């Protein structure tokens, strides 16, 4: 199963 990495960049 995939590691969940912290978000470091977002978009919108």
């Amino acid at each position, epitope marked *: 199963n995939e590691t*969940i*990495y912290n978000t*470091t*960049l*977002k*978009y*919108g």
Partner: antibody
Amino acid sequence: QVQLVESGGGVVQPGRSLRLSCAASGFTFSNHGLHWVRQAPGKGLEWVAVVSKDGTNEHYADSVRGRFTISRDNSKNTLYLQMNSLRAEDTAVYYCAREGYCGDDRCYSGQPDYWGQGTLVTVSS
Amino acid sequence: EIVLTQSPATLSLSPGERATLSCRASQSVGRYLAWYQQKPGQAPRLLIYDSSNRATGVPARFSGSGSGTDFTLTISSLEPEDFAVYYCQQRSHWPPLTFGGGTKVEIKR
């Protein structure tokens, strides 16, 4: 297993164009952002571009903005780099790399975790 | 951009010895710093992320440390397959995603 296979590199003259492809398998393609990273002969790694997991957002290294376009087709599990206005300094092996999952929202991790084998682009007159 | 400075350029060591590699940042990246291994002709392989977390299949002899602007990768006892080039990479402030210039761990004779 995660698999990433890049193609499209070749000898190209300055000012002309080349298109790189990277085909992916072994993971949920639409869950991950995708990067291109290059390595000039005898030099280190340099980031090129990224595209969001849904293909609606992208970012570029300053030195390729207006020249390279990154895109993806989630229907074909394929990542692209359209390379225009090529210059001698673009000569490098180009790697495609997925980044780690960050969640369900409009996010990037910025953490490459699997890399392809690289495709060589040689820009020369 | 956040510039990463790696030192030394070359580490010359024998199998079984400890290797310690430095990566410094031009401003704080918190703990968002990763390390890769690359052998000639091959693609980079992720070893460490978030300064000290080991990635899949990475043996215990590799350890990462640091925060802010000061980071190290330690190989407690070099194996023959460990002689390669190592790169650090930050993800705190991007784009651009930035890489250090690399450290070559080579065989001493």
